[PDB]
Amino acid sequence: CPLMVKVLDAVRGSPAINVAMHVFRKAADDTWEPFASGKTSESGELHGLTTEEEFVEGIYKVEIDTKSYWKALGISPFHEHAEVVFTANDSGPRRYTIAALLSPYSYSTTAVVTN
Amino acid sequence: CPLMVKVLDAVRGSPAINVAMHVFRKAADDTWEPFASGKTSESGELHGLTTEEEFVEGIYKVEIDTKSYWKALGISPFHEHAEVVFTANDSGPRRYTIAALLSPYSYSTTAVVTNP
Amino acid sequence: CPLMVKVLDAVRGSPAINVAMHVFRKAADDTWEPFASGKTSESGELHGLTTEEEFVEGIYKVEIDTKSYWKALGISPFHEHAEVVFTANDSGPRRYTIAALLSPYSYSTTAVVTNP
Amino acid sequence: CPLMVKVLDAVRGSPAINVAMHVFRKAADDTWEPFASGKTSESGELHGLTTEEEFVEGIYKVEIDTKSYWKALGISPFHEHAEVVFTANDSGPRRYTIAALLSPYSYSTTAVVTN
Ligand SMILES: C[C@@H](Cc1ccc(O)c(O)c1)[C@@H](C)Cc1ccc(O)c(O)c1
Ligand SMILES: C[C@@H](Cc1ccc(O)c(O)c1)[C@@H](C)Cc1ccc(O)c(O)c1
């Protein structure tokens, strides 16, 4: 698993479940080509987005639909979505965990990049 | 102003100075149109991006060039930029402060929204 | 001032108003001695805690009463308080802004340290 | 495992390894009684701090020695430590994960409280 996303809810102290997101790769014409998507599990995680062979160097965007999440909970949110844009694999294949911590008017995101 | 951005550096315990950012507004055809741009001051703040009359209802994107910031300090960071996308003024005019706290592999962003 | 605290609320997108906090300083015998206290203003800020002459070198603790804040909004939060412990003025006088962003199950805190 | 602590490094994008911490419970005389401690693993996690029977309702403090961590890396840090003080089990036994994300002049902490 070269890429995993984990989403937590700072209001409820829980994984953020059923959060949709899309992953894009930056094309040669500077546009965003969709390539993977999913929604978070009961543990707030999304696995199996890509494979080692497919996940080549490039610029990637993860667009997390935080607005629909807060809407489902009846809370008015600030952001349309949370976006995480990064260059991958600049020194060869790494495992990437992108974590996002969500509040109605704030989000934080961190990357844990390991072997 | 109706829109201000404040950026702090969590590694050095300081404002994040001379950070470039571009603001965009979503057009009727769903494209991002340039709206304003600027760089943070010595206090890590960027003021004067817009006016109450120009800052109409809509979806706005602030793209903060965090990568250039870190690269200039010798650091290769994780993110290309920090992106803040929000609907503004949907229930009448508001004042918006977007705050961002930066680390090489993490950032946090919050908004303070006040009624004029 | 040499010491200011700013508190924001991540649930409401606002300053965190009327938040109580107590500042302590470590004594020679390793106990925490009361140093100053106050509550945040409508802008979520607490100023005037100390002076440059009183704010000598030492280890300081700011205990922010985040639980009472959330309870007054109807929320049962995770933390009892947010605690910020730091050595101050070790290399001569500095100005310290302690910032905290609050959510019911999370908080973040950063410092801005500037040379007078 | 009723209580787990996970520590991440926001400068390096990695688990924060070998970070020491102590856990205290608030005594009847308003003082902090030590009861558990450890250091984080290669995954930045500390498990096995307590058991279901021992981890009764009360006020708990986790004192994370972030200053020694940054010192080992040659980076001057702001905080003496990061402290997490919470009331446990107020509605019966829950599993608690305390996460802390560290930078030299900042830390964030979140709780994920599940079944
Ligand atoms: C639980 C942490 C995420 C995480 C969980 C399991 C993992 O294997 C992992 O690598 C990261 C999360 C809370 C860390 C974190 C703390 C604070 C933050 O602001 C943030 O963006 C992320
Ligand atoms: C709002 C920032 C502080 C601030 C200083 C001066 C201002 O006029 C202001 O509006 C905000 C910032 C420190 C808030 C913040 C954002 C994100 C965080 O993670 C955090 O801990 C704190």
Side-chain angles (χ1 to χ4, degrees):
Chain A
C1 212
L3 173 64
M4 191 267 278
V5 180
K6 181 155 178 92
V7 188
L8 301 177
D9 178 331
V11 174
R12 298 191 299 157
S14 69
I17 306 157
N18 293 321
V19 176
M21 64 193 74
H22 282 78
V23 188
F24 305 86
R25 180 163 42 211
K26 177 104 93 164
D29 62 1
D30 267 307
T31 62
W32 294 108
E33 304 271 8
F35 73 97
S37 59
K39 66 183 181 158
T40 58
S41 73
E42 277 166 48
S43 69
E45 294 169 21
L46 176 50
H47 295 261
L49 288 163
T50 186
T51 63
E52 296 192 302
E53 289 78 3
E54 183 184 48
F55 193 45
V56 298
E57 293 185 300
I59 299 176
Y60 288 88
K61 174 173 78 169
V62 182
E63 212 159 70
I64 304 174
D65 187 1
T66 59
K67 186 178 182 192
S68 298
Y69 179 76
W70 291 117
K71 287 172 72 160
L73 295 176
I75 293 165
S76 28
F78 177 76
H79 304 91
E80 287 297 298
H81 51 253
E83 275 178 81
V84 179
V85 184
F86 63 101
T87 298
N89 294 323
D90 217 295
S91 312
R94 305 275 176 279
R95 302 216 294 129
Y96 292 82
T97 293
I98 295 153
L101 177 67
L102 307 186
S103 299
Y105 284 74
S106 183
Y107 72 85
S108 303
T109 188
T110 313
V112 181
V113 182
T114 54
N115 285 16
Chain B
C1 350
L3 183 57
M4 189 270 269
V5 185
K6 166 135 205 153
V7 190
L8 296 182
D9 173 332
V11 164
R12 290 197 298 170
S14 70
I17 300 166
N18 201 44
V19 177
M21 68 194 76
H22 295 253
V23 185
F24 304 86
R25 180 182 180 276
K26 197 142 72 153
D29 63 0
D30 259 21
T31 63
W32 290 113
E33 288 178 329
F35 180 77
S37 65
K39 272 166 181 187
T40 57
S41 68
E42 285 169 342
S43 70
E45 300 183 358
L46 174 57
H47 297 266
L49 282 168
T50 187
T51 60
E52 206 205 313
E53 213 168 355
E54 190 189 55
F55 195 39
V56 296
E57 297 191 73
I59 302 172
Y60 290 82
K61 171 164 60 164
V62 179
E63 283 185 15
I64 302 173
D65 183 10
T66 57
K67 182 178 192 182
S68 292
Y69 176 77
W70 291 118
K71 285 284 189 170
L73 298 171
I75 293 163
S76 301
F78 180 73
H79 304 89
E80 289 297 304
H81 63 252
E83 205 166 340
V84 178
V85 181
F86 68 105
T87 298
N89 308 304
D90 196 19
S91 308
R94 297 293 186 276
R95 298 195 201 90
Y96 295 87
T97 292
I98 299 165
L101 177 63
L102 309 184
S103 295
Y105 279 71
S106 181
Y107 69 85
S108 297
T109 189
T110 197
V112 179
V113 182
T114 69
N115 198 330
Chain C
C1 350
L3 183 57
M4 189 270 269
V5 185
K6 166 135 205 153
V7 190
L8 296 182
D9 173 332
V11 164
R12 290 197 298 170
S14 70
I17 300 166
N18 201 44
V19 177
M21 68 194 76
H22 295 253
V23 185
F24 304 86
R25 180 182 180 276
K26 197 142 72 153
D29 63 0
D30 259 21
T31 63
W32 290 113
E33 288 178 329
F35 180 77
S37 65
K39 272 166 181 187
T40 57
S41 68
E42 285 169 342
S43 70
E45 300 183 358
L46 174 57
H47 297 266
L49 282 168
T50 187
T51 60
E52 206 205 313
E53 213 168 355
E54 190 189 55
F55 195 39
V56 296
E57 297 191 73
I59 302 172
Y60 290 82
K61 171 164 60 164
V62 179
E63 283 185 15
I64 302 173
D65 183 10
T66 57
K67 182 178 192 182
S68 292
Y69 176 77
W70 291 118
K71 285 284 189 170
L73 298 171
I75 293 163
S76 301
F78 180 73
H79 304 89
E80 289 297 304
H81 63 252
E83 205 166 340
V84 178
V85 181
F86 68 105
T87 298
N89 308 304
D90 196 19
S91 308
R94 297 293 186 276
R95 298 195 201 90
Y96 295 87
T97 292
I98 299 165
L101 177 63
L102 309 184
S103 295
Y105 279 71
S106 181
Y107 69 85
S108 297
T109 189
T110 197
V112 179
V113 182
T114 69
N115 198 330
Chain D
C1 212
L3 173 64
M4 191 267 278
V5 180
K6 181 155 178 92
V7 188
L8 301 177
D9 178 331
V11 174
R12 298 191 299 157
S14 69
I17 306 157
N18 293 321
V19 176
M21 64 193 74
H22 282 78
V23 188
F24 305 86
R25 180 163 42 211
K26 177 104 93 164
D29 62 1
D30 267 307
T31 62
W32 294 108
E33 304 271 8
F35 73 97
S37 59
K39 66 183 181 158
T40 58
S41 73
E42 277 166 48
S43 69
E45 294 169 21
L46 176 50
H47 295 261
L49 288 163
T50 186
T51 63
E52 296 192 302
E53 289 78 3
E54 183 184 48
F55 193 45
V56 298
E57 293 185 300
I59 299 176
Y60 288 88
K61 174 173 78 169
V62 182
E63 212 159 70
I64 304 174
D65 187 1
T66 59
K67 186 178 182 192
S68 298
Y69 179 76
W70 291 117
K71 287 172 72 160
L73 295 176
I75 293 165
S76 28
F78 177 76
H79 304 91
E80 287 297 298
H81 51 253
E83 275 178 81
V84 179
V85 184
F86 63 101
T87 298
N89 294 323
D90 217 295
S91 312
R94 305 275 176 279
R95 302 216 294 129
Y96 292 82
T97 293
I98 295 153
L101 177 67
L102 307 186
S103 299
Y105 284 74
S106 183
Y107 72 85
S108 303
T109 188
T110 313
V112 181
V113 182
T114 54
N115 285 16

Coordinates of all heavy atoms in Angstrom, one line a residue, chain A residues 59 61 67 78-81 83-87 96 98 105-111 113, chain B residues 59 61 67 78-81 83-87 96 98 105-111 113:
Chain A
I59 N 3.0 15.0 -9.4 CA 2.4 15.9 -8.4 C 1.0 15.3 -8.3 O 0.3 15.1 -9.3 CB 2.4 17.4 -8.9 CG1 3.8 17.9 -9.0 CG2 1.6 18.2 -7.8 CD1 3.8 19.3 -9.5
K61 N -2.9 15.3 -6.1 CA -3.8 16.1 -5.3 C -4.8 15.1 -4.7 O -5.4 14.3 -5.4 CB -4.5 17.2 -6.1 CG -5.6 18.0 -5.4 CD -6.1 19.1 -6.2 CE -7.1 18.7 -7.3 NZ -7.8 19.8 -7.9
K67 N -17.0 19.0 3.3 CA -18.2 19.8 3.4 C -19.4 18.8 3.5 O -20.2 19.1 4.4 CB -18.4 20.7 2.2 CG -19.6 21.7 2.3 CD -19.6 22.6 1.1 CE -20.8 23.6 1.2 NZ -21.0 24.3 -0.1
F78 N -16.8 25.6 7.1 CA -16.2 26.7 6.4 C -15.7 26.3 5.0 O -16.0 27.0 4.1 CB -15.0 27.3 7.2 CG -14.3 28.4 6.5 CD1 -14.9 29.7 6.5 CD2 -13.1 28.2 5.9 CE1 -14.3 30.7 5.9 CE2 -12.4 29.2 5.3 CZ -13.0 30.5 5.3
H79 N -14.9 25.3 5.0 CA -14.3 24.9 3.8 C -15.1 24.1 2.8 O -16.0 23.3 3.2 CB -13.0 24.0 4.1 CG -12.1 24.7 5.0 ND1 -12.1 24.6 6.3 CD2 -11.0 25.5 4.7 CE1 -11.2 25.3 6.9 NE2 -10.5 25.9 5.9
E80 N -14.9 24.3 1.5 CA -15.6 23.5 0.5 C -15.1 22.1 0.5 O -15.8 21.1 0.3 CB -15.4 24.1 -0.9 CG -16.2 25.4 -1.1 CD -17.7 25.1 -1.1 OE1 -18.2 24.4 -1.9 OE2 -18.3 25.7 -0.2
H81 N -13.8 21.9 0.7 CA -13.1 20.6 0.8 C -11.7 20.9 1.5 O -11.3 22.0 1.7 CB -13.0 20.0 -0.6 CG -12.3 20.9 -1.6 ND1 -13.1 21.4 -2.7 CD2 -11.1 21.3 -1.8 CE1 -12.3 22.1 -3.4 NE2 -11.1 22.1 -2.9
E83 N -7.8 20.1 0.6 CA -6.9 19.6 -0.5 C -5.5 19.4 0.0 O -5.0 20.2 0.8 CB -6.9 20.7 -1.6 CG -8.1 20.5 -2.6 CD -8.1 21.6 -3.7 OE1 -7.3 21.4 -4.7 OE2 -8.8 22.6 -3.5
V84 N -4.9 18.3 -0.5 CA -3.5 18.0 -0.1 C -2.8 17.8 -1.4 O -3.1 16.8 -2.2 CB -3.4 16.8 0.8 CG1 -2.0 16.5 1.1 CG2 -4.2 17.0 2.1
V85 N -1.9 18.7 -1.7 CA -1.2 18.6 -3.0 C 0.3 18.4 -2.7 O 0.9 19.2 -1.9 CB -1.3 19.9 -3.8 CG1 -0.7 19.8 -5.2 CG2 -2.8 20.2 -4.0
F86 N 0.9 17.4 -3.3 CA 2.3 17.0 -3.0 C 3.0 16.4 -4.1 O 2.4 15.8 -5.0 CB 2.3 16.0 -1.8 CG 1.6 14.7 -2.0 CD1 2.4 13.5 -2.3 CD2 0.3 14.6 -1.9 CE1 1.8 12.3 -2.5 CE2 -0.4 13.3 -2.1 CZ 0.4 12.2 -2.4
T87 N 4.3 16.5 -4.2 CA 5.1 15.7 -5.1 C 5.5 14.3 -4.5 O 6.0 14.2 -3.4 CB 6.4 16.4 -5.6 OG1 6.1 17.7 -6.2 CG2 7.3 15.5 -6.5
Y96 N 3.3 6.4 1.8 CA 2.7 7.7 2.2 C 1.5 7.5 3.0 O 0.5 6.9 2.5 CB 2.4 8.6 1.0 CG 3.6 9.1 0.2 CD1 4.2 8.2 -0.7 CD2 4.1 10.3 0.4 CE1 5.3 8.7 -1.5 CE2 5.2 10.8 -0.3 CZ 5.8 9.9 -1.2 OH 6.9 10.4 -1.9
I98 N -1.3 10.0 4.5 CA -1.8 11.4 4.6 C -2.8 11.4 5.7 O -3.8 10.7 5.6 CB -2.3 12.0 3.3 CG1 -1.2 12.1 2.3 CG2 -3.0 13.3 3.5 CD1 -1.7 12.0 0.9
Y105 N -14.4 24.8 11.2 CA -13.7 25.9 10.7 C -12.2 25.8 10.5 O -11.5 26.8 10.3 CB -14.0 27.2 11.4 CG -15.4 27.8 11.1 CD1 -16.5 27.2 11.6 CD2 -15.6 28.9 10.3 CE1 -17.8 27.7 11.4 CE2 -16.8 29.4 10.1 CZ -17.9 28.8 10.6 OH -19.2 29.2 10.4
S106 N -11.7 24.5 10.6 CA -10.3 24.3 10.6 C -10.0 22.9 10.1 O -10.8 22.0 10.3 CB -9.7 24.5 12.0 OG -8.3 24.4 12.0
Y107 N -8.9 22.7 9.4 CA -8.4 21.4 9.2 C -6.8 21.4 9.3 O -6.2 22.4 9.0 CB -8.9 20.7 7.9 CG -8.3 21.3 6.6 CD1 -7.1 20.8 6.1 CD2 -9.0 22.2 5.9 CE1 -6.6 21.2 4.9 CE2 -8.4 22.7 4.7 CZ -7.2 22.2 4.2 OH -6.7 22.6 3.0
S108 N -6.3 20.3 9.7 CA -4.8 20.1 9.7 C -4.5 18.9 8.9 O -5.3 17.9 8.9 CB -4.3 19.9 11.1 OG -4.7 21.0 12.0
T109 N -3.4 18.9 8.2 CA -3.0 17.7 7.5 C -1.5 17.5 7.7 O -0.7 18.5 7.7 CB -3.4 17.8 6.0 OG1 -3.1 16.5 5.4 CG2 -2.6 18.9 5.2
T110 N -1.1 16.2 7.8 CA 0.3 15.8 8.0 C 0.6 14.7 7.1 O -0.3 13.9 6.7 CB 0.5 15.5 9.5 OG1 -0.1 16.5 10.3 CG2 2.0 15.3 9.8
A111 N 1.8 14.5 6.8 CA 2.3 13.3 5.9 C 3.2 12.6 6.8 O 4.1 13.2 7.5 CB 2.9 13.8 4.7
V113 N 5.9 9.7 6.0 CA 6.5 9.1 4.8 C 7.5 8.1 5.3 O 8.4 8.5 6.0 CB 7.1 10.2 3.9 CG1 7.7 9.7 2.6 CG2 6.1 11.3 3.6
Chain B
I59 N -17.4 31.4 -4.5 CA -16.4 30.4 -3.9 C -15.0 30.9 -4.2 O -14.7 31.2 -5.4 CB -16.6 29.0 -4.5 CG1 -18.1 28.5 -4.2 CG2 -15.6 28.0 -3.9 CD1 -18.5 27.3 -4.8
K61 N -10.6 30.6 -3.6 CA -9.5 29.7 -3.3 C -8.3 30.6 -3.0 O -8.0 31.5 -3.7 CB -9.2 28.8 -4.5 CG -7.9 28.0 -4.3 CD -7.7 26.9 -5.2 CE -7.7 27.3 -6.7 NZ -7.2 26.2 -7.5
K67 N 5.7 25.8 -0.4 CA 6.9 25.1 -0.9 C 8.1 26.1 -1.1 O 9.2 25.8 -0.7 CB 6.7 24.3 -2.2 CG 7.9 23.6 -2.7 CD 7.5 22.7 -3.9 CE 8.6 21.8 -4.2 NZ 8.2 21.0 -5.5
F78 N 6.9 18.7 2.2 CA 6.0 17.7 1.6 C 5.0 18.4 0.6 O 4.9 17.9 -0.5 CB 5.2 17.0 2.7 CG 4.2 15.9 2.1 CD1 4.8 14.7 1.7 CD2 2.9 16.1 2.1 CE1 3.9 13.8 1.1 CE2 2.0 15.2 1.6 CZ 2.6 14.0 1.1
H79 N 4.4 19.4 1.0 CA 3.3 20.0 0.2 C 3.8 21.0 -0.9 O 4.8 21.7 -0.7 CB 2.3 20.7 1.1 CG 1.7 19.9 2.1 ND1 2.3 19.8 3.4 CD2 0.6 19.0 2.1 CE1 1.6 18.9 4.1 NE2 0.6 18.4 3.4
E80 N 3.0 21.0 -2.0 CA 3.3 22.0 -3.1 C 2.9 23.4 -2.7 O 3.5 24.4 -2.9 CB 2.6 21.5 -4.4 CG 3.2 20.3 -5.0 CD 4.7 20.6 -5.4 OE1 4.9 21.6 -6.2 OE2 5.6 19.9 -5.0
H81 N 1.7 23.4 -2.0 CA 1.1 24.6 -1.5 C 0.1 24.3 -0.4 O -0.2 23.1 -0.2 CB 0.5 25.5 -2.7 CG -0.6 24.8 -3.4 ND1 -0.5 24.3 -4.7 CD2 -1.9 24.6 -3.0 CE1 -1.6 23.8 -5.0 NE2 -2.5 24.0 -4.1
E83 N -3.9 25.1 0.4 CA -5.0 25.5 -0.3 C -6.2 25.7 0.6 O -6.5 24.8 1.4 CB -5.3 24.5 -1.4 CG -6.1 25.0 -2.6 CD -6.0 24.1 -3.8 OE1 -5.2 23.1 -3.9 OE2 -6.9 24.2 -4.7
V84 N -6.9 26.9 0.5 CA -8.0 27.1 1.4 C -9.2 27.5 0.5 O -9.1 28.5 -0.2 CB -7.7 28.2 2.4 CG1 -8.9 28.5 3.3 CG2 -6.5 27.9 3.3
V85 N -10.2 26.7 0.4 CA -11.3 26.9 -0.5 C -12.6 27.0 0.3 O -13.0 26.2 1.1 CB -11.5 25.8 -1.6 CG1 -12.7 26.1 -2.5 CG2 -10.2 25.6 -2.3
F86 N -13.3 28.1 0.1 CA -14.5 28.5 0.9 C -15.5 29.3 0.2 O -15.2 30.0 -0.7 CB -14.0 29.2 2.2 CG -13.4 30.6 2.0 CD1 -14.2 31.7 2.3 CD2 -12.1 30.7 1.5 CE1 -13.7 32.9 2.2 CE2 -11.6 32.0 1.4 CZ -12.4 33.1 1.7
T87 N -16.8 29.1 0.6 CA -17.8 30.0 0.1 C -17.8 31.3 1.0 O -17.8 31.1 2.2 CB -19.2 29.4 0.1 OG1 -19.2 28.2 -0.7 CG2 -20.3 30.4 -0.3
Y96 N -13.2 38.0 6.9 CA -12.5 36.7 7.0 C -11.1 36.8 7.3 O -10.4 37.6 6.6 CB -12.7 36.0 5.6 CG -14.1 35.7 5.3 CD1 -14.9 36.6 4.6 CD2 -14.7 34.5 5.7 CE1 -16.2 36.3 4.3 CE2 -16.0 34.2 5.4 CZ -16.8 35.1 4.7 OH -18.1 34.8 4.4
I98 N -8.0 34.3 7.4 CA -7.5 32.9 7.2 C -6.2 32.8 7.8 O -5.3 33.6 7.6 CB -7.4 32.6 5.7 CG1 -8.8 32.7 5.0 CG2 -6.8 31.2 5.5 CD1 -8.8 32.8 3.5
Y105 N 6.3 19.1 7.0 CA 5.4 18.0 6.6 C 4.0 18.1 7.0 O 3.2 17.1 6.9 CB 6.0 16.6 7.0 CG 7.1 16.2 6.0 CD1 8.3 16.8 6.0 CD2 6.9 15.1 5.2 CE1 9.3 16.4 5.1 CE2 7.8 14.7 4.3 CZ 9.1 15.3 4.3 OH 10.1 14.9 3.4
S106 N 3.6 19.3 7.4 CA 2.2 19.5 8.0 C 1.8 20.9 7.9 O 2.6 21.8 8.0 CB 2.2 19.0 9.4 OG 0.9 19.1 10.0
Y107 N 0.5 21.1 7.7 CA 0.0 22.5 7.9 C -1.4 22.4 8.5 O -2.1 21.5 8.3 CB 0.1 23.4 6.7 CG -0.9 23.0 5.6 CD1 -2.2 23.5 5.6 CD2 -0.5 22.2 4.5 CE1 -3.1 23.1 4.5 CE2 -1.3 21.8 3.5 CZ -2.6 22.3 3.5 OH -3.4 22.0 2.5
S108 N -1.7 23.5 9.2 CA -3.1 23.6 9.8 C -3.6 25.0 9.3 O -2.9 25.9 9.1 CB -3.0 23.6 11.3 OG -2.5 22.3 11.7
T109 N -4.9 25.0 9.1 CA -5.5 26.3 8.7 C -6.8 26.4 9.4 O -7.5 25.4 9.5 CB -5.7 26.4 7.2 OG1 -6.1 27.7 6.8 CG2 -6.7 25.3 6.6
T110 N -7.1 27.6 9.8 CA -8.4 27.9 10.4 C -8.9 29.2 9.9 O -8.2 30.0 9.2 CB -8.3 28.0 12.0 OG1 -9.6 27.8 12.6 CG2 -7.7 29.2 12.5
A111 N -10.2 29.4 10.1 CA -10.8 30.7 9.7 C -11.5 31.4 10.9 O -12.1 30.7 11.7 CB -11.8 30.5 8.6
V113 N -14.3 34.3 11.2 CA -15.3 34.9 10.4 C -16.1 35.8 11.4 O -16.6 35.3 12.4 CB -16.3 33.8 9.7 CG1 -17.3 34.5 8.8 CG2 -15.4 32.9 8.9

